[PDB]
Amino acid sequence: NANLAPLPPHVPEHLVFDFDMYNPSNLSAGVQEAWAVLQESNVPDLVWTRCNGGHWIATRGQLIREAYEDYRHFSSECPFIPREAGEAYDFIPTSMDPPEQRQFRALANQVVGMPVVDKLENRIQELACSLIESLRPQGQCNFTEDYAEPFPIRIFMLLAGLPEEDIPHLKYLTDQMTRPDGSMTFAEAKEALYDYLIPIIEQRRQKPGTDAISIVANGQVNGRPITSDEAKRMCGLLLVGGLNTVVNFLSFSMEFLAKSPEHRQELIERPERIPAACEELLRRFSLVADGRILTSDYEFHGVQLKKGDQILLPQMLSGLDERENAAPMHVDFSRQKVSHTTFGHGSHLCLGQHLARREIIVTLKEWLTRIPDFSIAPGAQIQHKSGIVSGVQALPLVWDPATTKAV
Ligand code: HEM
Ligand SMILES: CC1(C)[C@@H]2CC[C@@]1(C)C(=O)C2
Ligand SMILES: [K+]
Ligand SMILES: [K+]
């Protein structure tokens, strides 16, 4: 096939597995299911795909975790596939490895961490309730556009102090960086995101507000003032994380709940399990997959990796690995040890995970409280899209208003 890059001389031909992270062959079975083909009986722990320019792929949690811990060998400098995207990628602190990464990560943690999450509580609460109540009597909705997107995105735009009317443009840009439809390269999308931020950053460095952008823009990096460029590279990252992650995860979770009344009933009858349900769904419907670049030749698990080689370390796969969780594809809200790397692993552990869990848990209880019974619109063939961050194309839900209830 013309879509396969010539196998480099150092890569064993028996380790070739032409997986396409942007269009996996088994996609129709579900995106997680599609990626899980990498964990079928005769697939090695580490394979090489000739797709998207050619790159390694760690298929088991053990290797994924090990690689994310070894930043000296596996650098975040070029974290995205294809290589061109990885090279243009300069977001802070994600494109940096410790020790340099730390001073910036600390600043980022200050704008989206637990303390700020605690502060957004009521607003997150209020927004969830207002959106769901308005949908309730209608007995129908396009979940992705009617909740998954507006709920977490409006919260983020609130935190960032940006007008909601800017969401369409920003959402399109961040979409192109994770699930490219082809109308824009990662570099072009990045250039546009930065173009958007530049004047906003300059404005808030002059007239500081209390929003996340102002805090970053006027912040300090281990004692010294952050620069305009640094603030741009950090804010750009925050925007990408805030407009694509929780948005897509909510859809995977709700699609599942819509197709399984028994689980819904479990959460209805016993709402104290929602948090545990949240973690299990985070494991089962994990959706992120970025990676690293080899800093030098290095033998990893019996495989000769060469400097410059890119290796995809799918955060999504660790928790689906049967060597981490028995019956991985089964959703068990009572699962004893929910093992996963959904929020990453190592020095780059998701800073917005606390905000994400809050948004997910609030969604689960507030939705189930008002719309206990709902299903996927009859005949609907739900479609997933694969990428750095996988998602659900559309999720038409239906329900009988009579079975609902105001709160
Ligand atoms: C379902 C929700 C989310 C998932 C699954 C998720 C997942 C991840 C993953 C896997 C990484 C590590 C990437 C790497 O190691 O290269 C990461 C990093 C990060 N996430 Fe999230 N994330 C979520 C929500 C959020 C939200 C809402 C924000 C808020 C803006 C956010 C902010 C960040 C930041 C700033 C980093 C970079 C930290 C660093 O590089 O040191 N995330 N996230
Ligand atoms: C892989 C990610 C989820 C993480 C936050 C946004 C994202 C797409 C990045 O570029 C780093
Ligand atoms: K070879
Ligand atoms: K780079």
3-class DSSP string for the chain: CCCCCCCCCCCCHHHECCCCCCCCCCHHHCHHHHHHHHHCCCCCCEEEECHHHCEEEECCHHHHHHHHHCCCCEECCCCCCCHHHHHHCCCCCCCCCCCHHHHHHHHHHHHHCHHHHHHHHHHHHHHHHHHHHHHHHHCEEEHHHHHHCHHHHHHHHHHHCCCHHHHHHHHHHHHHHHCCCCCCCHHHHHHHHHHHHHHHHHHHHHCCCCCHHHHHHCCEECCEECCHHHHHHHHHHHHHHHHHHHHHHHHHHHHHHHHCHHHHHHHHHCHHHHHHHHHHHHHHCCCECCEEEECCCEEECCEEECCCCEEECCHHHHCCCCCCCCCCCCCCCCCCCCCCCCCCCHHHCCCCHHHHHHHHHHHHHHHHHHCCCCEECCCCCCCEECCCECEECCCEEECCHHHCCCC
CA of 78 to the centre of ligand 4 (A): 5
What is the Cα–Cα distance from 290 to 342, expressed in whole angstroms?
Answer: 12
One-letter amino acid of 193 = L
- CA 352 to ligand 2: nearest atom: 5
Summarize the annotated binding site as residue ranges: 350
Chain centroid, CA 309 distance in Å = 24
Contacts 24+ apart (CB under 8 A), 97-103: 97/71, 97/72, 97/347, 98/71, 98/347, 101/76, 101/347, 101/348, 102/222, 102/347, 103/221, 103/222
What is the Cα–Cα distance from 286 to 281, expressed in whole angstroms?
Answer: 8
What is the Cα–Cα distance from 267 to 371, expressed in whole angstroms?
Answer: 12
Method: X-ray
Q: Which residues contact 356 (CB under 8 A, 6 or more apart)?
A: 245, 246, 249, 343, 350
Ligand 1 within 6 A of 364 CB?
A: no
Copy the structure tokens of residue 163. Answer: 């007008």
Ligand 1 within 6 A of 242 CB?
A: yes
Residue with the nearest Cα to atom 11 of ligand 2?
Answer: 94
Residue 285 CA: distances (Å) to CA of 15, 250, 267, 281: 27, 9, 18, 6
Q: Is the dihedral of CA 49, 52, 55, 56 positive or negative?
A: negative
What is the Cα–Cα distance from 29 to 26, expressed in whole angstroms?
Answer: 6
Residue with the nearest Cα to atom 6 of ligand 1?
Answer: 343
Q: Is the separation of the CB atoms in 271 and 365 below 8 Å?
A: yes
CA of 407 to the centre of ligand 1 (A): 33
CA of 234 to the centre of ligand 4 (A): 14
CA of 130 to the centre of ligand 2 (A): 29
Ligand 1 within 6 A of 351 CB?
A: yes
Residue whose entry in the numeric block shows the structure tokens 């995205």: 80
- CA 79 to ligand 2: nearest atom: 10
How many angstroms is the resolution? Answer: 1.9
Residue with the nearest Cα to atom 1 of ligand 2?
Answer: 290
Around ion ligand 4, residues with a beta carbon closer than 5 Å are 78, 87, 89
Give residues (CB < 6 A) around ligand 2. Answer: 91, 94, 178, 240-241, 245, 288, 290, 388-389
CA of 153 to the centre of ligand 4 (A): 27
Q: Is the separation of the CB atoms in 151 and 363 below 8 Å?
A: yes
Domains plus CATH for the chain? 1-407 (1.10.630.10)
Residue 36 CA: distances (Å) to CA of 65, 77, 186, 390: 17, 27, 26, 14
Summarize the annotated binding site for heme as residue ranges: 350
Torsion of Cα atoms, 205 then 359 then 252 then 166, to 10°: -30
Copy the structure tokens of residue 300. Answer: 């990893």
Closest CA to 316 of 278, 291, 287: 287
Ligand 1 within 6 A of 79 CB?
A: yes
Residue with the nearest Cα to atom 2 of ligand 2?
Answer: 241
Residue with the nearest Cα to atom 7 of ligand 2?
Answer: 241
CA of 269 to the centre of ligand 2 (A): 36
- CA 290 to ligand 2: nearest atom: 1
Ligand 1 within 6 A of 54 CB?
A: no
